[PDB]
């Protein structure tokens, strides 16, 4: 089946009780989906998921007829820890000699505590301007290339340049590699799409 998913980068601000993701069956046949939210971290240089009770999806199961647009509600159970960005994945499982396909769609979901925001709105931009750590702060080293985020916000990098995926907050991520090109400078640069527009951020050597 065919789905339009909007927005693809949902988030819940500190002052917001819930957000909405819209699922529309843009196809000709009916579809049945399961909606789940898992907590997301990058401990041990790997993406880890786990059951969680902070963000509640509604409904957990939905029959989406052809053409029908459904509103998925993502509700915060309680307020989140101050000044911190929580990471989640929203999982949409499409339920059904030949081998057939079962589609699973995964999009990031971020939720904020007091004092930090997404930076996708004026309100949250003025918030993060008062916070020195409300941004990705990436350091790099070579073992493969390691990226350590010391800021309170995630980075989403499309490319790395010697001259001008996800790295969650307070996390270190490993990438396969350019190593001599790495050992030839001190700062590299990454194209980050975590904010309102693509921007180069400075990555300093560890």
């Amino acid at each position: 089946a065919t789905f339009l998913i909007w927005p693809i980068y949902p988030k819940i601000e500190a002052n917001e009780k819930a957000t909405a993701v819209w699922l529309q069956n843009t196809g000709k046949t009916d579809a049945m989906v399961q909606i789940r939210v898992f907590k997301w971290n990058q401990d041990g240089l790997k993406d880890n998921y786990s059951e969680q009770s902070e963000i509640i999806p509604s409904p957990p199961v939905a029959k989406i007829k052809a053409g029908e647009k459904h509103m998925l509600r993502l509700t915060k159970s309680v307020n989140l820890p101050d000044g911190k960005e929580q990471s989640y994945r929203l999982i949409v499982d499409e339920l059904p000699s030949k081998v057939s396909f079962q589609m699973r769609y995964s999009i990031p979901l971020f939720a904020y505590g007091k004092g930090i925001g997404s930076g996708l709105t004026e309100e949250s931009q003025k918030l993060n301007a008062k916070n020195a750590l409300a941004k990705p702060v990436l350091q790099w080293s070579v073992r493969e290339l390691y990226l350590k985020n010391n800021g309170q916000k995630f980075a989403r990098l499309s490319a790395l340049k010697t001259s001008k995926g996800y790295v969650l907050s307070n996390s270190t991520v490993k990438f396969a590699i350019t190593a001599h090109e790495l050992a030839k400078t001190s700062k590299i640069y990454g194209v980050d799409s975590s904010g309102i527009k693509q921007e180069l951020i400075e990555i300093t050597k560890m």
Binding site: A1, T2, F3, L4, I5, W6, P7, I8, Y9, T26, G27, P96, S97, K98, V99, S100, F101, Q102, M103, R104, Y105, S106, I107, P108, L120, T121, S158, G165, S193, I196, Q198
Partner: protein
């Protein structure tokens, strides 16, 4: 601020796989003209990166079961089948502004020739944004 939306979506039939066969069995979900395919289209103006991982099937080894005997198969990103969809491992894609990025899936079964045999399996295709 422009919120990106993306359209996603939206069967490898190897034919009869009973008995024996001397050549490679092939099937594909890669083109609208070939029957249809999986694709991703996002409404923004900047490219959107995403990842496709395919599991190992009902038995995690990618084999079709008779429902009464198995037959090993694999799924590739490539018609020449040089680029395997290695089980559960991400495969990198990127969208182009205003255009559909296909997620092509090419299936193959090695020649049997010796040892004669419905056959079904379900693959989980995970698209990660």
């Amino acid at each position: 601020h422009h919120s990106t939306g993306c359209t996603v979506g939206g069967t490898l039939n190897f034919g009869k796989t009973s008995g024996t066969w001397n050549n490679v069995l092939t099937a594909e979900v890669a083109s609208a003209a070939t029957g249809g395919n999986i694709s991703v289209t996002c409404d923004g103006t900047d490219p959107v990166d995403f990842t496709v991982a395919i599991d190992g099937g009902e038995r995690t080894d990618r084999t079709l079961k008779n429902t009464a005997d198995v037959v090993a198969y694999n799924v590739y990103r490539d018609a020449a089948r040089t680029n395997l969809y290695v089980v559960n491992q991400p495969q990198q894609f990127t969208t182009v502004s205003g255009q559909a990025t296909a997620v092509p899936i090419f299936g193959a079964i090695a020649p049997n020739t010796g040892t004669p045999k419905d056959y079904k399996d379900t693959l989980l295709v995970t698209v990660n944004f």
